[PDB]
Design an enzyme around this catalytic site. Structure first.
Site, short mmCIF file in Angstrom:
data_model
loop_
_atom_site.label_atom_id
_atom_site.label_comp_id
_atom_site.label_asym_id
_atom_site.label_seq_id
_atom_site.Cartn_x
_atom_site.Cartn_y
_atom_site.Cartn_z
CD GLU A 117 -2.73 -1.30 2.36
OE1 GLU A 117 -2.94 -0.26 3.23
OE2 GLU A 117 -3.51 -2.56 2.43
CG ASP A 172 -1.71 -0.22 -3.25
OD1 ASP A 172 -2.55 0.08 -2.27
OD2 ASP A 172 -0.53 0.57 -3.42
CD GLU A 226 -4.49 -7.88 1.68
OE1 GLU A 226 -5.27 -7.44 2.45
OE2 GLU A 226 -3.18 -7.59 1.90
#
Ligand code: CA
Length: 352
Positions: free
Chosen positions: A136, A190, A254
């Site tokens: 991120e 990200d 994720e």
């Protein structure tokens, strides 16, 4: 006795699930769920910076050690999440070692980054195949994160080489990792980039610039924190293609699918209608993943949890709001979304 999920997909990519330590315990029903259905493992939290080095020079090996032993024992891959982030990172990283009231130096933070990355990567050479080297690093408001967008790395380290660009700390994180492990797959990870053209614009520019410098980046990780409301498959396909066009691979790191669009909707009961719709959406996503798997450019797809009884979405973005984002329900029962993956005929594609 239901089909093994990863096996049924017949993918080149690994299929993973994020876990806590309880899924490494044999007396826990989550463990057998993990080994039956998945062939890759990510630590949700126990391999973050604050878990691995809570105080300077004091590494914690017990949890990741147990992870790698479990993974080797069960013929599973491991992703290392994550070596660098601006959340779940101890304050001591960014303060002067002798004056905790003043910031760390460029040189001090560079050295700290190197020690953290290399001690960890070196220990797990050949045991952890893949690392989220940075997590991120791009602001949602544009450009690389800095203090205003929650991160202290770029303000402290800055333009090391003096070339007018200040992505140096990211480049260094990758170089340090590769130096500690020549074989590891190195990932920039990200969120949001699958559905935000502006954020993906920044990801593309960043990776292009780093690759041009000879930075060892193997893949762009898409967290894929999506909802039942979006983004649409077409947007995602577009972002995936932009990543693959750079010559790197893609990873879905994720994956979860919230039943809510954001933070305004109050808790709602799960219905079989909602679960059917979630199933159509997961089926579409896995059809998209196959497109890229067929090109040999998808390394892995990881669900952000095994089952709905352990989703971080129960507290993000609304504390205390129960979600239903994963492939197994709160009692570990396979959901319609699971059934659409192993037997696409369970999903009705016509009416009358
Ligand atoms: Ca520079």
């Amino acid at each position: 006795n239901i089909p093994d999920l990863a096996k049924k997909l017949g993918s080149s990519y690994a299929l993973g699930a994020a876990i806590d330590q309880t899924a490494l315990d044999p007396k826990d029903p989550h463990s057998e769920l993990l080994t039956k259905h998945f062939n890759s493992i990510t630590a949700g939290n126990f391999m973050k910076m604050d878990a691995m080095q809570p105080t300077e020079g004091k590494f914690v090996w017990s949890e990741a050690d147990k992870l790698v032993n479990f993974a080797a024992a069960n013929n599973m891959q491991v992703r290392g999440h994550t070596l660098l982030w601006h959340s779940q990172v101890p304050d001591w990283f960014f303060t002067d070692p002798n004056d905790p009231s003043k910031p760390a130096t460029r040189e001090q933070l560079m050295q700290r980054m190197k020690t953290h990355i290399q001690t960890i990567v070196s220990r797990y050479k050949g045991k952890v195949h893949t690392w989220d080297v940075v997590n991120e690093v791009i602001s949602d408001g544009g450009g690389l994160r800095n203090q205003a967008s929650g991160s202290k790395w770029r303000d402290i380290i800055g333009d090391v080489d003096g070339d007018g660009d200040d992505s140096d700390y990211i480049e260094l994180a990758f170089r340090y990792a590769r130096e500690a492990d020549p074989d590891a797959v190195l990932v920039i990870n990200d969120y949001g980039i699958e559905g935000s053209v502006s954020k993906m614009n920044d990801m593309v520019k960043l990776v292009e610039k780093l690759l041009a410098k000879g930075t060892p980046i193997d893949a762009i990780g898409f967290q894929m924190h999506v909802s039942m409301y979006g983004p649409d498959i077409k947007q995602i396909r577009e972002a995936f293609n932009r990543a693959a066009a750079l010559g790197v691979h893609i990873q879905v790191t994720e994956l979860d699918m919230s039943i809510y669009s954001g933070n305004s909707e109050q808790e709602k009961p799960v219905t079989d209608e909602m679960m059917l719709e979630q199933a159509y959406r997961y089926r579409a996503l896995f059809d998209l993943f196959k497109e890229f798997d067929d090109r040999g450019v998808m390394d892995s797809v990881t669900l952000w949890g095994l089952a709905d009884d352990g989703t971080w979405l129960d507290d993000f973005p609304v504390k205390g709001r129960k979600d239903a984002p994963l492939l197994f329900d709160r009692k570990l029962k396979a959901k319609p979304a699971y059934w659409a993956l192993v037997d696409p005929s369970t999903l009705p594609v016509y009416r009358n």
